[PDB]
Structure 1
Amino acid sequence: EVQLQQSGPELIKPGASVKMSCEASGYIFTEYYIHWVKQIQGRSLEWIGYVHPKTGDVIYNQNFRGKATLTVNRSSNTAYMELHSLTSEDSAVYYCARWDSWGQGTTLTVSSAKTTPPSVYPLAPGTTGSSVTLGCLVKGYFPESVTVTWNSGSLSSSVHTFPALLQSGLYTMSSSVTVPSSTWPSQTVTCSVAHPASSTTVDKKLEP
């Protein structure tokens, strides 16, 4: 019923600004405060401020004076947050929220690195025993995220997806799958690495 629907992920150069949106449906937009909240590392939350959409009046956290501007468009039931003069400290997930319901979040990456597809390397043994662990190493891409699908989804129980880390300004992650040895190499195992930001998919068949 009540829904807050936010705009998509953003990759912005340091020094620029970005304006993200929060569309309200299922209630009277002008009756509820809209709050904005910054989350880093999927953990620490910091409140930015809130606006009354009936009037447009804003109250900010002093920590965001000059960094954030909150506005509304009453005719479209949308709240907006503009962040100015961006730095890498502004990379985070940003949520809009009313008192009882949050949007799904907008991920902001502030960087001058260009969108780059991953290199994908197979991890295969060149066993003994009844199981075998395989993997794919996904290196040198930007920005987040990638998805690694094993045997287009038929494997997922015994899959481990390791979160990406930065190296040389680009992301690297890995993914493992453990499968009965009676199924590999006698049957195909493939990792399919999708990087939607670069409109690239890479499929590797794992070979002994």
Structure 2
Amino acid sequence: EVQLQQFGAELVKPGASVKISCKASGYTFTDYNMDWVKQSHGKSLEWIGDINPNYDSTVYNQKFKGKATLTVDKSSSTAYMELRSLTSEDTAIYYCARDGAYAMDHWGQGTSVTVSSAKTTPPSVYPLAPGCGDTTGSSVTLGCLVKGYFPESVTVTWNSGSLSSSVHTFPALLQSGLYTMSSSVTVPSSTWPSQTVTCSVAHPASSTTVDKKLEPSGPI
């Protein structure tokens, strides 16, 4: 329907600048304004500013004056936020949203921004399969351990979405400057190992995707 696609660097070095993008689709870009919004620590939503794409008219929160700068390119129906002089307090999720008569009625999916001098590190993907001699059981839980990656954005797809129910995402924890998360799935034992189960680990920050197949430990 209406759709807002955000893009931008997820890892940016302190004191530098990043420009986030927001591609609008499914409505006339120039009939509405675009708001930008900072969510920090998954908690507090702060409004950054407003841009009218007709007049290039902008209204900033004073807190963000000089930090953020809103722009658009009506040609491609895309709004841009540029943050500058990046600092550890600038590390957060940044949303664009369409502002009309019904407040912010469609939001982008957010750009997670991490300010850090550390370099990007793709995850190790380790399969979690019942091993040794375990009960076959009426169901079987398989998992993947996604370890040693930075920055944090990772998504784990099981069998290209076919096994989307019965999926547990375990939130990442940061330890020695690297993240580790895991992801479990539970399926009938009639399913595995007779049928192939794969966890697909996408780490955009490193442009890496890793398919790990969950393999039985011995023959059945």
Q: Structure 1: any 5+ residue segments left out of the alignment?
A: none
- Displacement of 1:123 in angstroms is 2.2
Q: Secondary structure at the match of 1:116?
A: coil
Q: Secondary structure at the match of 1:145?
A: coil
- Asked whether 1:165 is paired with 2:173, we answer yes
Deviation string, structure 1 residues 121-169 (Cα, Å, up to 9, x no partner): 2223322332332211110112233332334443232221222222222
Instruction: Normalising by structure 2, report the TM-score.
Output: 0.77
- Asked whether 1:122 is paired with 2:127, we answer yes
Partners of 1:63 and 1:74 in 2: CA distance? 27
- Displacement of 1:207 in angstroms is 3.0
Aligned-pair identity (%):
75
CA contact (8 A) 2:11 2:116 kept: yes
- Report matched runs for 1:1-208 at 5 Å: 4-24=4-24, 26-27=27-28, 29=30, 32-73=32-73, 77-97=77-97, 98-99=99-100, 100=102, 101-104=105-108, 105-125=110-130, 126=132, 127-128=134-135, 129-198=137-206, 199-208=208-217
Q: Secondary structure at the match of 2:182?
A: strand
- Displacement of 1:37 in angstroms is 1.0
- The change in CA–CA distance for 1:55 and 1:174 in structure 2 (over 3 A counts) is same
Instruction: Normalising by structure 1, report the TM-score.
Output: 0.80
Q: Secondary structure at the match of 1:136?
A: strand
Q: Secondary structure at the match of 1:157?
A: coil
Counterpart of 1:168, as a letter, is S
CA contact (8 A) 2:71 2:81 kept: yes
- The change in CA–CA distance for 1:201 and 1:53 in structure 2 (over 3 A counts) is same
